[PDB]
Symmetry: C3
Subunit: 332 residues, 3 copies
């Protein structure tokens, strides 16, 4: 059974096919690839773009999306095995998955880490659980990786440079400020897709503490070795931005401090200058700037940068609808 | 780009056309004016009638409604410009609108005032923001005015009197009791539509403190001067109800006391007799009584009055579905 | 006007017809029995299976479901008559029903008891209110009885034994442990359907305190007298499980202790051994085990029992979708 948990699990040929069908669905939004079918969208965290682009994509394809929010409407799920359920968890994913598997044709899930212990959050238990017990294809709507966002990003880029081949482009994935520590998910997915697309990726972040987990720094290496691109870390802003083609901002907490954020507040606070501003965008080769959104203005980026024509975040967001339709149509 | 923020922005010819298409949709509920299209319903406050009649109207027209509740499911939005987003607001309406604008064909928004400072609430910032940044038509689902409800009301009336011409009818818009101060929105919209329809509007309320904002009292004046009707204020019950044709109840807090309700509690509390009862309905020319709902029984109106055959609140509510389908079909 | 509040209100011929159309819809999921129609699903409590199977069933039949959650999205309703609404209730069911009656073709409602006073909860006020004021057919999505679940259960059984006639089968409806006291609804519905299907029902529970309300113990009697089966109470486990064909577990609080659960905690706590385990399932005539779900693993049943092939809870759950489509198609 084929799922869509990470782009990494897919071959370059399949990804390529996915971006093209995306491009296609973008030319003709309506179809019947999902006529009579349906998908259960399970959210354990907030969402606007994801929720909306999926709910519409299913409608635009003849299917129907059923949104579920365990804890709000649906019953809270248990993921640990053999555990004795006498706490707050009402049912077990082993039953929930097999059941959704009787009503729907697809299952999408969204569950940000709990931020208490990275060791435990890096196992991506919810998504893996779903994938294991579900008799139907499972789709990552973001956990510790945001595969869907990756393709939307990749397409917005291929669109911008007028070609599918993005090799040779200097891609700068920059960390950026945020009053509180956020999920690394997108940063990981960015690094993964940027390296996979064969670009000259530069992971810009404040201190070595902010470097992404090894798994992802390693997936990146294999991608370079494959796409003939390159990965590189930089703690110096200007040296990075210097003549870039693409610039993706994303704030996230330092993994080492998981479960111990107190000592990090003072640390991140001294890097607010990482915000993406015109000055930095000036240092680029008329580069394009993007973000997954929701973006906090004048914190992650400046009003100028957002209103700037080089900001393709809106297009990238819209592609989420086309990319996801390609993923669903594929999986069925 | 044409929106539907207020009936006032529309010419009488257009409104007239809207009520007729409403009457039409009421004869044949199913159509394809929205085939393949969709609308994002953004609610910052509770709703039953609005949510339901829109969600169904879109379905009855081949479209699809995507309900969003910033703060519950979707991410909380920021409306102030240049502000530095390091608080509770996660994204800015400038991005949210442009984005929804990539997924949907229409956007509906509902945001009651915050009741802290009328000066700030009277600017209808959320609706105006949406209208400004959205590349697609925006629809007022109620803010400081309830345009949609107006047409539902106007149609229920034209239906009741068997004619579109409601001139000459004595329309009494009466304030009514409620333990807590409520939005003036409906009262404004009532005054606006009643005067616009050319009736003999009488704004009945306890003290001059309860008279509606100037903007609305002025829109009303221009409507009289146009429709050849009349506006009038009354602090005396009986003199008002006296031989009326229409009676619309609605409770709301006194604008002067915005942000300072403590001193108003004792004031409203001494007007509970404003409740709509049989006695008052007796003083009318076999008039018809209505309310936008949700109505608190035996507080705003008496059980008798509601169960009375002259109560057309249920029909008025149902029209909300027909009126709104006319508005959507129009806007696309 | 015909509703679906309880299976009891229906004749055996109608129920029989319902299970067959269910079996049918199970062979061909898509249809147009609900083309253009819609149903308002009102939930005053959490739900996963019910919400999802209804929302999809309506979609699979050309209709549209509109989910409403009074208190979350929709406004909180008042059910008591003549009461003076100056509290938390915003509108009255008399208006809500008549209104939904103008937008939808069907209304489903879910409202678990309040657990404060059984005397008051046994009147099933919400469902009865809905049925009374609604001009359209009302469907019990579970209150003090779970009619829908009954048919899903009955079908999963007829499917398992390869025949519609389940007479002669030893049906053991066993109470089971749960840290907190739960609704008796399902237990009642089980007793009702098991006896109605003409099986040898045995109500297994700890102490006479746990025996279900008289109404249900009496409906059961009349069912036996009709279906030629039998009802029986057992406080001894083994004597019950002993060579059974069907085993339905369900935890619920002792009715006598309604509003006074303190003194029951210590009582239920000494019956955790009621959990359904392999040992007990061994004592059965290769019986089949089921539960309505959501089930708390290693509390109500053991991991073994759930993963056991005799556990038909997943199939029973899936039937909820087929059974409910038969109920809707019928009611319109
Ligand atoms: C697609 C982005 C989802 C998420 N974003 C947040 O939860 C940020 C919340 C905030 O800044 O208030 C994240 O960090 O990955
Ligand atoms: C269509 C009416 C919406 C709203 N009503 C309320 O929020 C009243 C709430 C209450 O009375 O509990 C208002 O005052 O305009
Ligand atoms: C279909 C079952 C619905 C409900 N179940 C619960 O509310 C159990 C909640 C829990 O065990 O946490 C009940 O008891 O009837």
């Amino acid at each position: 059974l084929k799922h869509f948990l990470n782009t990494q699990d897919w071959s370059r040929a399949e990804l390529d096919a996915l971006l093209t069908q995306a491009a296609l669905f973008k030319r003709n939004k309506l179809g019947s690839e999902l006529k009579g079918k349906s998908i259960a969208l399970v959210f354990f965290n907030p969402s606007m773009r994801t929720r909306t682009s999926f709910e519409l994509g299913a409608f635009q394809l003849g299917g129907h999306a059923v949104v579920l929010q365990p804890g709000k409407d649906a019953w809270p799920i248990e993921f640990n095995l053999g555990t004795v359920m006498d706490g707050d968890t009402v049912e077990h994913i082993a039953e929930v998955a097999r059941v959704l598997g009787r009503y729907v044709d697809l299952i999408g899930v969204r569950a940000f880490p709990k931020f208490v212990d990275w060791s435990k959050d890096r196992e991506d238990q919810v998504l893996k659980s779903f994938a294991k017990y579900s008799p139907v294809p499972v789709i990552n709507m973001e956990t510790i990786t945001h595969p869907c966002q990756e393709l939307a990003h990749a397409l917005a880029l291929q669109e911008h440079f007028g070609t599918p081949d993005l090799r040779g482009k200097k891609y700068v994935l920059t960390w950026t400020y945020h009053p509180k520590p956020l999920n690394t998910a997108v940063a990981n997915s960015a690094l993964t897709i940027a390296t996979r697309m064969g670009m000259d990726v530069t992971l810009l972040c404040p201190t070595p503490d902010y470097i992404l987990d090894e798994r992802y720094m390693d997936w990146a290496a294999q991608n370079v070795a494959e796409s003939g691109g390159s990965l590189q870390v930089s703690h110096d802003i200007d040296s990075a931005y210097a003549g870039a083609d693409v610039v993706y901002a994303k704030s996230w907490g330092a993994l080492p401090f998981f479960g111990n954020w107190e000592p990090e507040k003072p640390i991140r606070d001294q890097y607010q200058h990482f915000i993406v501003d015109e000055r930095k965008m000036a240092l680029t080769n008329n580069g394009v700037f993007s973000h997954c959104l929701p973006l906090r203005r004048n914190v992650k980026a400046t009003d100028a940068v957002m209103d700037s024509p080089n900001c393709i975040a809106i297009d990238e967001a819209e592609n989420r609808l086309h990319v996801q339709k390609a993923i669903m149509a594929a999986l069925v």
